[PDB]
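We store sequence, tokenised fold; for instance:
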Amino acid sequence: KGCIKEGKWCPKTAPCCRPLQCKGPSPKQKKCTKV
């Protein structure tokens, strides 16, 4: 499935696409955010 795009759920420092840092307001809503 390629990589993890923004808006998708991902763990800490997960294998994001590139621009995403894999952040999130909480562990239950941890999604890949772009900077």
About this structure: Residues 1-35 form one domain.
